[PDB]
Amino acid sequence: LPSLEDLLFYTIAEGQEKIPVHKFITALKSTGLRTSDPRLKECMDMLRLTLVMLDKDLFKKCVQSNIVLLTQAFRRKFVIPDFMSFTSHIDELYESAKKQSGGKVADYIPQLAKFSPDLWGVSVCTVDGQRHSTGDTKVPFCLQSCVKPLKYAIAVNDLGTEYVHRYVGKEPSGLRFNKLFLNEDDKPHNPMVNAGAIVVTSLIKQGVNNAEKFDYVMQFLNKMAGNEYVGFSNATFQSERESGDRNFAIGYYLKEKKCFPEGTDMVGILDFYFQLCSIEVTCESASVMAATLANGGFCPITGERVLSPEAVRNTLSLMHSCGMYDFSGQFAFHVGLPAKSGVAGGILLVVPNVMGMMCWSPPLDKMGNSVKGIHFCHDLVSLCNFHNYDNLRHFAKKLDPRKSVINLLFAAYTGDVSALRRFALSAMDMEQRDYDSRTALHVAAAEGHVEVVKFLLEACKVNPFPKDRWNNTPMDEALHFGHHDVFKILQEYQ
């Protein structure tokens, strides 16, 4: 059992007796992990507490406490194994999109106009926590309609599909059925329209007052971003309630047409709605939110189950088809990713099973989508086979940036002679030990599996007397559990 810590040491130390601390860090960062990663804190603490050269046993002390993640990182077995060559493509696409200067920054409130039109940031967070940023990725801005899928997920996670969609539909609008707010059953078309977003707000945490509702949603967004920046621009909040007269009118129509949960303080909901629109993110922290959606409801940098599988599935679905304003059908055809855009210039972008992403540049096009971000999303999917209906085998000129010993013993356990035959012809080591120094022979003996024991002995010619951590041989195991014939067979080897 040559130890996992040294096994990695040999990976970094290409023959050197000791590894410099800075070689480890740049190798580390080369997988795309950041040293700020919460899952690497124990290791960085020890690195700093080595206060510059690390030998096999000093180094093994630092990496020991995060050895599972570092193992998966340096066996370059992340979802994107060659991250360095991936981040250059991201940088090329960023540089290219930076040259489109069209679009008008939203001035309907001054806080949206205070932002320079030159601001442009993209940040990547993969399902495994690899991070990458280019441009203005640590500037806070407001989510705006980028919060619509997030509050819809929360609702669905808490209440379930059937409840939520008693009050809101699940279809794209189609054309100008937008101005016809309500569909055939007199509900908003889907949660990504303002009328649907407003209704979704009325469903979240009913019974408590607004300040608890807002506290629930922020703690939730904070879990979704893995404790990265989730803020609030009160300035934006007050202008939004002052200019949101059109949404009050929409609210009165909704309350009169009985679309809210019966007994609902309408102006209370709309204050909540503007509160939620004003929540602040950076592209870094929003990308972790996106990567939580990209990763089935689990936050990559904390491991936490935040959203149920159903809430993610529904959210990603309606984002794919209702996420980009009147450009959503066009986006769905050509980009094929679930995204959501907002009037601060953010595009919350998700690549199911790979990464999340937030892009931000304030200039909006005629449809309200960020000009540089829309350019970026088209380029990304031309470059890589990320479209929803790209193939993972025959994808043409696009780039695709994408058996254990437990396997062995569980076959020995269940008696599957066919499986071990494949493994042996697979050139697997049939004498591998698990964490208990257990062997396929051990397990197959204890279960009295005669055709497995013989296969391991006669065909794979394995050692007949391995020792457990309790110093038992398969023969011991056979006797112990009543499998005398198996005991006899191995006894023939002494």
Ligand X SMILES: CC1(C)CC(=O)c2cnc3ccc4ccccc4c3c2C1
Residues 153-182: x where in contact with a second copy by CB under 8 A, - otherwise, as a string: -----------------xxxxxxxx--x--
Question: Is residue 470 involved in binding a second copy (CB under 8 A)?
Answer: yes
Cα 494 from Cα 491, distance rounded (Å) = 5
- Using alpha carbons, list the distances in angstroms from residue 257 to 161, 186, 188, 267: 22, 8, 11, 15
Q: Does 207 bind a second copy (CB under 8 A)?
A: no
Residue 162 interacts, among a second copy, ligand X, none and using kind-specific CB cut-offs from 5 to 8 Å, with ligand X
SS3 labels along 101-126:
CCCECCCCCHHHHCCCCCCCEEEEEE
Closer to a second copy by Cβ: residue 127 or 204: 127
Alpha-carbon torsion (43, 44, 49, 51), positive or negative: positive
Q: For residue 132, give the nearest of 338, 296, 356, 352 by alpha carbon.
A: 356
Q: Between residues 54 and 106, which has the closer beta carbon with respect to a second copy?
A: 54
By CB under 6 A, tell whether 98 contacts ligand X: no
Number of residues in contact with ligand X under rule CB under 6 A? 5
In the set 109, 153, 269, 312, which binds a second copy (CB under 8 A)? 312
51 contributes a contact to a second copy by CB under 8 A: no
Q: Does 305 bind a second copy (CB under 8 A)?
A: yes
> In this structure, are residues 99 and 375 in contact, taking their beta carbons and an 8 Å threshold?
no
φ, ψ (nearest 5 deg) of residue 341: -110, 160
Taking CB under 6 A as the criterion, the residue among 161, 243, 404, 426 binding ligand X is 161
* Residue 411, contacted partner among ligand X, a second copy, none, CB below 5-8 A by kind: a second copy
Alpha carbon of 141 to those of 91, 116, 283, 288, 347: distances in Å? 22, 12, 9, 15, 12
415 binds, among a second copy, ligand X, none (CB under 5 to 8 A by kind): a second copy
* Window 337 to 356, contacts with a second copy (CB under 8 A): 338, 352-353
- For residue 316, the minimal CB distance to a second copy (Å) is 4
Residue 382 Cβ, how far from ligand X at the closest point, in Å?
A: 6
Q: Which residues in the 318-337 window bind ligand X by CB under 6 A? A: 334
* 162: contact with ligand X by CB under 6 A: yes
145 is in an annotated binding site: yes
Q: Tell me the residue type at 243.
A: S
DSSP 253-299: HHHHTT-SPSS--HHHHHHHHHHHHTEEE-HHHHHHHHHHHHTTTB-
Using Cβ positions, the residue closest to ligand X within the complex turns out to be 378
CB atoms within 10 A of CB 192: 26
One of 26, 246, 418, 494 touching a second copy (CB under 8 A): 418
- Of 102 and 110, CB closest to ligand X: 102
Tokens of residue 211, six digits = 């300040």
Interface positions, 375-394, toward ligand X (CB under 6 A): 378, 382
- Binding positions for ligand X, 407-466, rule CB under 6 A: none
Q: Please report how the helices 148-159 and 309-322 are oriented relative to each other, as an axis angle in degrees rounded to 10.
A: 150
Task: Look up tokens 């967004």; give the residue.
Answer: 221
Binds a second copy (CB under 8 A): choice among 33, 54, 62, 66: 66
* DSSP letter assigned to residue 19: E
Q: Give me the least distance between CB of 228 and a second copy, in Å please.
A: 16
Please report how close the Cβ of residue 170 comes to ligand X at its closest, in angstroms. Answer: 8
Q: How far apart are the first and last CA of the chain?
A: 26
Q: Are 315 and 155 in contact (CB under 8 A)?
A: no
Binding residues for substrate, as ranges, are 145, 194, 240, 247, 273, 325, 343
Interface residue list for ligand X (CB under 6 A): 161-162, 334, 378, 382
Binding residues, as ranges, are 145, 194, 240, 247, 273, 325, 343
